[PDB]
């Protein structure tokens, strides 16, 4: 029900949900913010904001379209959502203003205004968006001196020396046809889509993007940007997790769903099936925490990201959740496994099926770029319910028992004890 066909160049991937309204056609490239050097960084976000600029969006809005884009750590996407009877308009707009000539987009008035707005919103993100910036510093210190370490939005110091030559070089080096996947979600049928991509000739280039010299290797590290102006203490620690197209991927997502996510002020998240919430609820050790499991192309992370207003008992929160992490290897039960199985099925269903047909476009483009064909919601559910407690114990002994962690913090984090205690509290002496 998620059909994929390889044409002369590009790969077309689509899914036809005939009850949805807005059909959404776009192209998803396989060169995100980890396919460049740290000096031209932020050229992916700059390309996204060039595509989303006032000129391009007014041209798209006069015809009845609505642009979208999403830059991630290996795929970047350009989505033109539209009405269901109007997608040949979407296709030839995306041809005429992104795939062929872009001289209307890349002259030094629109590029100057776009670069100024990008500089303002990146520095506003760096000052006033605290949990995302420490997840970003966690990525920057986990995979350091190695191309997965890069900021997605780009840093300010490597964004004020970018001109149109950088964007044209990136569009020549990474906006290819053996690197691109065109996607269709919403209610377009498959064959009218490829009929309209093969009627009007649509091909970006012919070549191949440059392969990287250094693969993503985890380096157990530590960083702290302690700003004691801030009222909270945002820390986040994470180990090396399993990447995409790895056999231990769904057990990593299940082991994240075992500990779940929490919010101390909602009275329905204080009653979950976590054993950690009987330790962190008598002195109110944190405000929220969420156990992520990110899986990029070469490697990935596995850890929790919190926020703490009780900045004196930070080490107790760290120690309690790390003992709960060691409970995965030594004595995890089966009722936690089945609770996390049902909750992981619910979360993947809420992610894969939703009202917006551009998130499905981004997910379908990513997992057709890296894998080759999309596995359905049924096969994912079968691979989830085929997981026993011993597979979780084997994976937790593989990737969580005494492994190197990487910590990224900000705020009032002097109460955070320093590194060797946190590293050697990942392994207890069997109680």
Ligand X SMILES: CCCCCCCCCCCCCCCCCC(=O)OC[C@H](COP(=O)([O-])OCC(O)COP(=O)([O-])OC[C@@H](COC(=O)CCCCCCCCCCCCCCCCC)OC(=O)CCCCCCCCCCCCCCCCC)OC(=O)CCCCCCCCCCCCCCCCC
Ligand Y SMILES: CCCCCCCCCCCCCCCC(=O)OC[C@H](COP(=O)(O)OCCN)OC(=O)CCCCCCCCCCCCCCC
Residues in contact with ligand X by CB under 6 A are: 319, 323, 428-429, 431
Binding site for ligand Y (CB under 6 A): 424, 427
Closest to ligand Y by CB, 112 vs 418, is 418
Nearer to ligand X, 265 or 431 (CB): 431
Per DSSP, the three-state class of 74 is coil
CB of 220 to other proteins, least distance (A): 4
Q: Which of other proteins, ligand X, ligand Y, none lies near 424, with the C-beta cut-off 5 to 8 A by kind? A: ligand Y
- Does 55 interact with other proteins (rule: CB under 8 A)? no
Among 226, 371, 398, 421, binds other proteins (CB under 8 A): 226
- CA torsion through residues 367, 372, 374, 378, sign: negative
What does 83 interact with, of ligand X, other proteins, ligand Y, none (CB < 5 to 8 A by kind)? none
Least distance CB 424 / ligand Y (angstroms): 4
Nearer to other proteins, 7 or 403 (CB): 403
Report the residue closest to ligand X, judged by CB.
Answer: 428
* Cβ neighbours of 266 (radius 10 Å): 10
Tell me how far the alpha carbon of residue 256 is from its chain's centroid: 16
Candidate residues 126, 315, 339, 343; the one interacting with other proteins per rule CB under 8 A: 315
Q: Is 287 in the site for other proteins (CB under 8 A)?
A: no
Residue 404 touches which of ligand Y, other proteins, ligand X, none (Cβ within 5-8 Å per kind): other proteins
Give the binding range for other proteins (CB under 8 A) out of 102-110, 186-194, 352-360, 419-427: 419-427
HSE, side-chain direction, 13 A CA sphere, residue 124 = 6
Q: Does 399 bind other proteins (CB under 8 A)?
A: no
Q: How far is the CB of 420 from ligand Y (least distance, A)?
A: 7
Q: How far is the CB of 427 from ligand Y (least distance, A)?
A: 6
Torsion of the alpha carbons at 388, 349, 69 and 152, rounded to the nearest 10: -30
- Pair of tokens at residue 384: 């989830």
* CA–CA distance, 339 with 257 (Å, rounded to integer): 9
Using rule CB under 8 A, residue 203 touches other proteins: no
Least separation in angstroms between residue 244's CB and ligand Y is 32
Considering CB distances under 5 to 8 angstroms, the limit depending on partner class, which of ligand Y, other proteins, ligand X, none binds residue 431? Answer: ligand X
Alpha helices in 43-129 (DSSP H): 43-51, 54-63, 88-94, 110-128
Tokens of 116: 């100024």
Pairwise CA distance, residues 359 & 382, whole Å: 23
Stretch 123-162 residues interacting with other proteins (CB under 8 A)? 141
Half-sphere CA count of 367, side-chain side, radius 13 A: 20
* Residue number, 222 or 391, with CB nearest to other proteins: 222
CA gap 211, 173 in Å, rounded: 11
Q: How far is the CB of 425 from ligand Y (least distance, A)?
A: 7
Q: Which is nearer to ligand Y, 246 or 427 (CB)?
A: 427
CB of 396 to ligand Y, least distance (A): 18
Q: How far apart are CA 396 and CA 330, in angstroms?
A: 9
Give the span between the Cα atoms of 96 and 164, in whole angstroms.
19
CB of 322 to ligand Y, least distance (A): 12
Distance CA 187, CA 19 (A): 7
- Which one among 7, 110, 221, 263 touches other proteins, defined by CB under 8 A? 221
Identify which of residues 1 and 420 has a Cβ nearer to ligand Y in the complex. Answer: 420
CA-atom Rg of the chain in angstroms: 23
Residue 426 C-beta: closest distance to other proteins, Å: 11
- Nearer to ligand X by Cβ, of 323 and 339: the residue is 323
β-strand pairing of 406-410 with 76-82: unpaired
Nearest CA among 8, 366, 26 for reference residue 184: 26
The encoded tokens of residue 235 equal: 């820390």
**Under 8 Å between Cβ of 244 and 297:** yes
Angstrom CA distances, 408 to 236, 239, 242, stand at 5, 12, 20
Query: In the complex, what is the shortest distance from the CB of residue 423 to ligand X, in angstroms, rounded to a whole number?
Result: 13
CA atoms of 183 and 364, how far apart (whole Å):
7
Q: Could you say which of ligand X, ligand Y, other proteins, none residue 419 binds, taking C-beta under 5 to 8 angstroms by partner kind?
A: other proteins
Residues contributing to the site for other proteins (CB under 8 A) = 141, 219-229, 311-315, 404-405, 412, 414-420, 423
């Amino acid at each position: 029900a998620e059909v994929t066909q390889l044409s002369n160049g590009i790969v077309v991937a689509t899914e036809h949900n005939p009850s949805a309204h807005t059909a959404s056609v776009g192209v998803v490239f396989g060169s995100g913010a980890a396919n460049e050097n740290p000096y031209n960084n932020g050229v992916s976000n700059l390309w996204k904001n060039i595509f989303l600029s006032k000129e391009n969006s007014a041209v798209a809005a006069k015809e009845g379209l609505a642009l979208s884009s999403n830059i991630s750590r290996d795929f970047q996407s350009y989505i033109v959502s539209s009405l269901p009877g109007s997608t040949d308009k979407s296709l030839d707009f995306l041809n005429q203003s992104f795939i062929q000539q872009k001289a209307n987009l890349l002259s030094s008035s629109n590029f100057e205004a776009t670069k100024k707005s990008v500089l303002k919103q990146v520095q506003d993100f760096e000052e006033n968006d605290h949990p995302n910036r420490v997840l970003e510093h966690l990525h920057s210190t986990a995979f350091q001196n190695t191309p997965l370490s890069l900021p997605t939005r780009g840093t300010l110091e490597s964004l004020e020396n970018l001109v149109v030559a950088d964007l044209e070089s990136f569009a020549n080096n990474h906006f290819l046809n053996s690197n691109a996947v065109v996607v269709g979600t919403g209610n377009i049928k498959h064959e009218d889509l490829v009929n309209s991509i093969e009627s009007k000739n649509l091909s970006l280039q012919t070549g191949t993007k440059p392969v990287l010299k250094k693969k993503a290797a985890f380096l157990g590290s530590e960083v702290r940007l302690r700003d004691d102006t801030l009222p909270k203490a945002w820390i986040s620690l994470a180990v090396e997790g399993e990447p995409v197209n790895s056999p231990n991927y769904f057990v990593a997502k299940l082991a994240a769903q075992i500990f779940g996510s929490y919010n101390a002020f909602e009275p329905a998240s204080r009653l979950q099936g976590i054993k950690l919430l009987d330790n962190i609820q008598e002195y109110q050790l944190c405000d929220n925490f969420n156990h992520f499991s990110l899986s990029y192309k070469d490697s990935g992370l596995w850890g929790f990201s919190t926020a703490t207003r009780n900045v004196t008992m930070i080490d107790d929160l760290i120690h309690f959740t790390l003992k709960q992490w060691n409970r995965l290897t030594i004595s995890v039960t089966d009722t936690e496994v089945e609770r996390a199985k049902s909750l992981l099925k619910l979360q993947l269903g809420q992610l894969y099926e939703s009202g917006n047909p551009v998130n499905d476009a981004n997910l379908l483009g990513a997992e057709v770029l890296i894998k080759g064909s999309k596995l359905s919601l049924g096969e994912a559910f079968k691979k989830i319910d085929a997981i026993t407690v011993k597979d979780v114990k084997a994976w937790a002994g593989k990737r969580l028992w005494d492994q190197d962690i990487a910590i990224a913090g900000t705020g009032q984090i002097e109460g955070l004890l320093d590194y060797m205690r946190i590293r050697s509290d990942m392994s207890m002496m069997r109680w």
